[model samples]
Target: MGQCSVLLFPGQGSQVVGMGRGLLNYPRVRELYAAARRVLGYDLLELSLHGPQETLDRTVHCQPAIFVASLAAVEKLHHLQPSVIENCVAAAGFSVGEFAALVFAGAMEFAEGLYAVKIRAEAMQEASEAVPSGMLSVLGQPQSKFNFACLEAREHCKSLGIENPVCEVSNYLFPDCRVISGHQEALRFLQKNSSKFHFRRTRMLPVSGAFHTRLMEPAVEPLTQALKAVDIKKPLVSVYSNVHGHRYRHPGHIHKLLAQQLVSPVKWEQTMHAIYERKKGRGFPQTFEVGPGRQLGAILKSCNMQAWKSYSAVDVL
Candidate 1:
């Protein structure tokens, strides 16, 4: 087969529930888990392989678990298809998944990626605890409509005597489905006004706060400083970025984007389109989702119905 790019997805909150289970059966995965445990000084494999829910729910553990599990899946997939890695062109990942993509792209070593995830998770966790925030998924609205809805929601929260009632369009999942995050009060406002906004449904996420919104600004500087010291090499293959939904070629830009990603909305739909548009007719790119959840696959299909023809990932194995 000719060379083709692979897109990876990351940054799903649901991944905390059951991640890294399949890796326990593979030797390479087992080794990577062991190495990660040593570096992190926690039995991460145990938590992911045999989670009690509470431990896995913690941001500190979940972030690393997802990263390691994703990489482990990549390793297993490569072993199964020896030519897949060599045939692959570019790669891209969602929020936290971007870190996994970078590791796969050779921008950073696995160990370095692991440590960076650890730092990011801890800092984000701290920020989450320091504030009262929440996220809500709004379906059946365009970006402009969503922003208008947020404005209305903010107004509602103000009228209801809620403090710091900030609401913003967070992640643009699709033309109809978008995520909004802010204070819990703002979420309540959005929920109450959902019927008036033409949204089909609103599902509240189980996140501590409004991640990827300005609420995460406090964590950005620390993350940026942590990332500044880590040495980044040019990607072995092209990698797309969520910040702009475009391929990041410059190492300096990659570093800046990674730091900015904390508070920046993840343009996953755009990122996928960029990949599809760039690699069209060159043979469909084989996507390997190196992460804990199957959310990416579902989103890719939503973005492009024919996407499944070329996208494949070891979601569970």
Candidate 2:
């Protein structure tokens, strides 16, 4: 295939301060951040460039921060190897990274996408704070009973009067690494019983809510309405959905998928297989992780070594 290029954008947890210095070297990067401030009513660039880690880590801030920084990193990529942009056949993102891929594929404008991300962040933040909920990163052993453990956790929450409590896998990162999300109580139970589930390790993610679970249900309507107002066109290049790892087929599907994405597990590992599923003789496609962190590069390494070997990350800091 002539388009042996795939672009990956990092999501929320991949942000860090002291970034975007390289993005400034690209033309119009400042103008881009200025637009974000106009819509968000706060200087995203200032916060991202100089963060008291707590402020930058907030759901309200990191969503758009990762979105803009990922796209801005694309400018750096464009400045160095414009051919990478021209030859891109497919692109995918982890979570908030989806908005960046959409803009790059001509599905949404930078301003409109950021505005949608702003509303998504605020809505999600409010929903997260409504209850004591969170996510956990789980590195499972070969025989881990992940689903059973989630069931046990949910039943444990039900015992605690959390009706219809959510305890489920939210992100399928790689072969055996899954990020589970739900009520904080359920997570604690899971952590306490990790050995029973055969999980090697479990670490709490620095997040406020159980994203990609029912805990984020309250945020869906706001994000849906926000996306409806934005102009969504069919992507010029392919973009994968986190829901099913399927290639997005229509402009009309974006709003629906995004709304569903809140409560649906992020099928990122599935997406990697989809992108690298071409004919055996075609060879692996070159990938570029255009964002603030190299996390996507790390995930790609876990999913497919040949593809990862052909991959590179566009530096943002």
Candidate 3:
């Protein structure tokens, strides 16, 4: 059997109140949370294992919490099937999950990666608080005009005297599914005209602000400086970037793309194609979603049915 493996780490919105509960049985799993505590100045495992729900859901806390918890799950995966970690050939993460992928690939140490995520989350949170913005999930139909809807939303924002109004796709989750983020007014505009744009479903995400759009431009500098503050070696395995759905070429490329990722659409669907596309009839790699949620697994099923057949998600609890 082909033993080459792939790992998919999840981003935000995956965390739950009782994640990481069962993972502590494995050796070295507890140490990850202890290390996270030292780096983040709080007990992450405590919050994750016994969350008040609201505290763990905060942007500043959740990003780092997910990062550490995802890595902790790796320890469990390794304990059960060491070969999977040894044979992991490629990896990708959605949003903050990219940092976990890098740490797993040996591009950076766990503590350093956690620190970087801390800085990123804080900066993003501040950016969100600075403006009244949010994200809207849209299940677009074949006839949906996403770009046109954003244009009209922006026009409406302008009519309300919003300057340089932002409204655009923040995440490309899968075919016909996207998350649009921008000024709150722009989001409301889109929701108001969902039928006109052929969006069959429009739901407002419970997020702090419009992420992955120009609205997050204010977050770039602090995150860039934080990334620069750490050392990033070349990833031991091929790790995909959210900015362009491509593999990282070097540490320099990682820095450039991670910073750019904040304000650029998360091209997850493109990254999935790049990872799973192969010569016809080639056996698919065994894939594991090593995190708190099964969202990546669901997305994989949507993107490639054949690949999903070989996928497994390591249970965090």
Global CA lDDT of candidate 3, please?
Answer: 0.92
Candidate 3 displacement at residue 295 in angstroms: 0.6
Candidate 2 — which residues are off by over 4 angstroms? 1-3
What is candidate 3's lDDT per residue for 56-153, written digit by digit as tens?
99899889989988998899999999999998989999999999999999998998899889999999999999879999999997799999999999
Pairing residues by index, what is the TM-score of model 3?
A: 0.98
lDDT of 2 by residue, 29-81 (tens): 88888888898898889899999789999999999999988888888888888
Question: Among these predicted structures, which one has the highest lDDT?
Answer: 3
For each candidate in the order shown, give its overall lDDT on alpha carbons.
0.78, 0.91, 0.92
Model 1, range 1-317, lDDT digits (tens) per residue?
A: 46565757566474655577765676588889888987799898778766888778677777888888888888877777767788777787777888988998889988888888888888888888866888898887452367778888778777878666779877877667788998888888778878777878999987777888888888888888878878998998888888888888778777788888888888887877777765334566667666777788888888876766677767543
Query: Candidate 1 or 3, higher TM-score?
Result: 3
Ranking by TM-score: 3, 2, 1
The count of backbone overlaps in candidate 2 is 0
My TM-score estimates for the predictions, one after another, are 0.93, 0.97, 0.98
lDDT of 1: 0.78
- Give the candidate order by descending lDDT: 3, 2, 1
The residue pairs found clashing in candidate 3 are: none
